[PDB]
Design a protein around this nucleic acid. Structure first.
Lengths: 51, 185, 103, 52, 126, 148
RNA sequence: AUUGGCGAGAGACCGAUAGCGAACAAGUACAGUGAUGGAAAGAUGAAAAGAACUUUGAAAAGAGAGUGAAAAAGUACGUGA
RNA sequence: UGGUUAUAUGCCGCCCGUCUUGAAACACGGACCAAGGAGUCUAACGUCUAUGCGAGUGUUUGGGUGUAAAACCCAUACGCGUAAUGAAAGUGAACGUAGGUUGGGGCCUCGCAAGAGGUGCACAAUCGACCGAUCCUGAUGUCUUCGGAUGGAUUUGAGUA
RNA sequence: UAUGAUGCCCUGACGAGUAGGCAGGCGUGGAGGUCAGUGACGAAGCCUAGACCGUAAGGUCGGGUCGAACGGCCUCUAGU
């Protein structure tokens, strides 16, 4: 009966998902986590719907 | 073997840096350190102290106290500054036009101030519009009207709300609280 | 993706790649090891549906009782705000960076 | 004036169709909140272990 | 990736199902691939091993020696080809155990159940 | 958690934060609230004035449904009106279009007066009012209807 | 509802003085009139190829020779504090 | 030259741990070595910090869903909070730009500056006002014993302001 | 432009301490990310009056032995 699972406030969980989505913008952060994207087109990369 | 008049290596007791790791707040501190160091006007060294303050010492400041400070004479064109949040208040209905600057505005306060024709201003825009703080106010919310501050200083004859969980009858209103049961206080 | 038509079975074998619906967007996939940043290959329908999902000033929420977080600062650049027009008018003239040792 | 990300086709060949940024990318990037929420959200898959 | 809830990726369970499998599944674990000649002949990648096949070694210190199996030795997960031996210092000959996933089959030994077994798996035999 | 705890900073020290003289021992003052009228009387007087003794009438078989009475000051009383209708109702303050407020369906058992509602006459439907409450509502022009 | 039985699936669990008393012929060996108590004990090597043969000795073993990538891997066997 | 190490010489240096006013003790543990080995987890809370919203807040009892013990979304209620006080019946917070005065950060105006004046949030002190209780006063009307208006008191509360 | 603003630099004062409090770091088993890290042309461990770094916990290297896995860093965690 150790406290295994941990609550988060729902809005703070939403806050972190919003900040992470905002972080997959401009590629300073993207090159900061591995991610060999040194030559890609403009970031975010949006492929068309056929995929 | 120096005689010690006061205590050695005594930290001054204030904060010099906010304990929070809000990066954007570190940017506002990084701006106001510059402005406090070089503009050498008083208004800047007060807001720098206020960003250092904790959550408790930044109480939320309702929009009605802003309405009081604007009904206060002569301040009817000033830009009120609140370091800390500004929360809504449904008790006022009439509300003036002037501009408010703060860190955080709750959605009710944003809708209210923009609804009356005002403008919510993040403090960098006030640093742009007022480097020396021309024609401004500072409000501070009530600090010691917390829940917890009701409980400090508890002792006999001082009247400060004993620390208790469930109230009503039967929970600490017997001997020690009334004259009929033993003693009072 | 926005609308799954057999894409997850296509990419689920090639290692490292994880797919996601816009309705999910797990935090465990968007910042692994709590480090911000992923190489996110959006799709177009997913991009317009992202506009629908997380709200803006234009569309309202799609999550009951939600709006985006707000800025406590308008511009993330600081020295641009420091330099630009108004502040340098009020700034006293600077000293030396490191001080001369006197005595 | 959103930065107008161009849709890209499957063979490279950047299609001239441009789409605005959906203002989710103008959200504040708070690394610490992502950090604390990643800790407390990553804890939520643990099975219990115990001695007899 | 594992999709069913029926099979286990637990490592202990796999090695436990391996080292204590009974001999009837040890005919199945000791499958051996076929040559290119045979999969052009029969059209099938691999079969279980049997004691009379003519087989060739493709890995090890006996790489290239071919021969017939003498006996399949299912306790040690082994297969003793008759030509592959190691002489002992007192003059004797001791068969070297090979593992049949490292062999290549050249000539089979078809009776009925090898015939019907090839028929079940896409046979095109002669 | 335990990499941040202070016994992890106390390894190496013999008493582990608990002193050599008065050793850390099991329960030196008894278990729990023991001795409140005895050796701990100086803790029951101050910080707990009133803990010992009976007072009231006993109340057998209480039900909080008999005491459901959530109050409402006059100075909220407009959150109960929808906000998009609120500016319609504050403007053109007149009778025959007076708003109707049901305090009951919002969960408000009694109206209490607290001070200075605006001057728009408003029909308020409630279960209980106070003497200062109906006087302020009546001074605004609107009326009160007691419902059950 | 479910620390039992059967059949499964998993872990930010322990890793052999830990994890069940028991990873091994473990409720075993052994103690006790008895009720009951109750251990210790994993890993040579890919493969026994586990040292043919010569020589000293009553023999055990020795020293050569040989196996094996390696016997500072020889069954008193991973490393070996 | 210098470092390390052994030895030499000069001078110094009593076995550590522990209770103890006091230990090298003729006080107690310690022959030695390896591995094990002691302020943890939970329920409920206090102070302070950090975070999210903010007159509100808490998705996770449960439902929809799924790349399925995670993730994402959600209607109800419900907990705490926005209102106190009494044994209880009950009652229930603006006289007055939600007051006065004093001291107060900051701002504004004049002044070259020094200083003068206005404004004074937070907070301290103090006088008042309002709410509940208690002790009184007790009117217009009265199911003719009810109803309590008004006004008070070296009273009182863990209240409003 | 070219680097850290929880940096760099100037000035001054001061620095014993049991019980105890606080802060800054070192070390161990496991988890997420990362260095497209090391590794049977030899990991990890062990021995070493051989060498270097840190005030110290500790780190790093050279040699011998050895035979398969393991380390730095940003974070989580405890049967540390």
């Amino acid at each position: 009966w150790r406290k295994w699972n941990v609550k988060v406030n729902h809005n703070e969980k939403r806050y972190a998902t919003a900040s992470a989505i905002a972080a997959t913008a401009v590629a300073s952060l993207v090159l900061a986590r591995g991610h060999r994207v040194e030559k890609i087109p403009e970031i975010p990369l949006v492929v068309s719907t056929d995929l | 073997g120096i005689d010690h008049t006061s205590k050695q290596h005594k930290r001054s007791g204030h904060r010099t840096a906010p304990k929070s790791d809000n990066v954007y707040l570190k940017l506002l501190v990084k701006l106001y350190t510059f402005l406090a160091r070089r503009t050498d006007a008083p208004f800047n060294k007060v807001v720098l102290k206020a960003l250092f303050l904790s959550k408790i010492n930044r109480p939320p400041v309702s929009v009605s106290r802003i309405a009081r400070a604007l009904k206060q004479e002569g301040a009817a064109n000033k830009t009120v500054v609140v370091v800390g949040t500004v929360t809504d208040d449904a008790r006022i209905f009439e509300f003036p036009k002037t501009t408010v600057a703060a860190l955080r505005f709750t959605a009710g306060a944003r809708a209210k101030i923009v609804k009356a024709g005002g403008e919510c201003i993040t403090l960098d825009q006030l640093a742009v519009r007022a480097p020396k703080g021309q024609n401004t106010l500072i409000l501070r919310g009530p600090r010691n009207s917390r829940e917890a501050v009701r409980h400090f200083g508890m002792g006999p004859h001082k009247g400060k709300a004993p620390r208790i969980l469930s109230t009503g009858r039967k929970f600490e209103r017997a001997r020690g609280r009334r004259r009929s049961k033993g003693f009072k206080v | 993706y926005a609308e799954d038509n057999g894409i997850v079975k296509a990419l689920r074998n090639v290692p490292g790649v994880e797919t996601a619906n816009v309705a999910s967007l797990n935090l465990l996939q968007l910042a692994p090891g709590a480090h911000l940043g992923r190489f996110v290959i959006w799709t177009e329908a997913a991009f317009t549906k992202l506009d629908q999902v997380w709200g803006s000033e234009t569309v309202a929420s799609s999550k009951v009782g939600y709006t985006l977080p707000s800025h406590i600062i308008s511009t993330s650049d600081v020295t641009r705000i420091i330099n630009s027009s108004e502040i340098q008018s009020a700034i006293r003239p600077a000293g030396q960076a490191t001080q001369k040792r006197t005595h | 004036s959103r930065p107008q990300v161009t849709v890209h086709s499957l063979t490279g060949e950047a299609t001239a169709n441009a789409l605005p940024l959906p203002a989710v990318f103008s959200a504040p990037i708070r690394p610490d909140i992502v950090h604390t929420v990643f800790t407390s959200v990553n804890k939520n898959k643990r099975q219990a272990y115990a001695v007899s | 990736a594992k999709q069913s809830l029926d099979v286990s990726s637990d490592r202990r369970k796999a090695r436990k199902a391996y080292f204590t499998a009974p001999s009837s599944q040890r005919r199945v674990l000791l499958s051996a691939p076929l040559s290119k000649e045979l999969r052009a002949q029969y059209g099938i990648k691999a079969l279980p091993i049997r004691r009379d096949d003519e087989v060739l070694v493709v890995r090890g210190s006996k790489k290239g020696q071919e021969g017939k199996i003498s006996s399949v030795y299912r306790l040690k997960f082994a297969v003793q080809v008759d030509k592959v031996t190691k002489e002992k210092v007192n003059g004797a000959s001791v068969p070297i155990n090979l593992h049949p996933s490292k062999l290549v089959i050249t000539k089979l030994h078809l009776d009925k159940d090898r015939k019907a077994l090839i028929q079940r798996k896409g046979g095109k035999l002669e | 958690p335990s990499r941040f705890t202070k016994t992890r900073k106390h390894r190496g020290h013999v008493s582990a934060g608990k002193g050599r003289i008065g050793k850390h021992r099991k329960h030196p003052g008894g278990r729990g609230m023991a001795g409140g009228q005895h050796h701990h009387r100086i803790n029951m007087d101050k910080y707990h004035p009133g803990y010992f003794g009976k007072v009231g009438m006993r109340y057998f078989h209480k039900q909080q449904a008999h005491f459901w009475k959530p109050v409402l000051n006059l100075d909220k009383l407009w959150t109960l009106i929808p906000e998009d209708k609120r500016d319609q109702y504050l403007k053109s303050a007149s009778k025959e279009t007076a708003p109707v407020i049901d305090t009951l369906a919002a969960g408000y058992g009694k109206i209490l007066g607290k001070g200075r509602i605006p001057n728009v006459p408003v029909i308020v439907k409630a279960r209980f009012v106070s003497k200062l409450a109906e006087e302020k509502i009546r001074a605004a022009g609107g009326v009160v209807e007691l419902i059950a």
